[PDB]
Request: fold
Amino acid sequence: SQSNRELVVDFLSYKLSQKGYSWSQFPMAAVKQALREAGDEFELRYRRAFSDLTSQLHITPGTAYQSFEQVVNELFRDGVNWGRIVAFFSFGGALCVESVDKEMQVLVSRIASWMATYLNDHLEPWIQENGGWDTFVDLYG
Reply:
């Protein structure tokens, strides 16, 4: 999916802009907008910015995808649902904000690639079974 990479990049650039950071580190319009809104709703409800999960990751330029996948898997203990997909985007955005805070902005494009990998491998199977991104738009748009 080229569409999935674009969605990840849009959500991450959105979150970086919104929070005061640079995003220069790297129908589709309705999915992008619905997701932006969903992440904002998610983040007002759950304020801790995945602090324990980012700590569990302990991301560095040495970190490989397998380590990211294992931590992200934690969001899906009880399988996929729509809020947990939003949680996933929100977590990657948190990781990216952490990385820019740390002067580790080299991580941001890597995190984006990893999120696209994970979404394609692990999340799209459920998404497609439950009505695809059109159903996401009905729900959140």
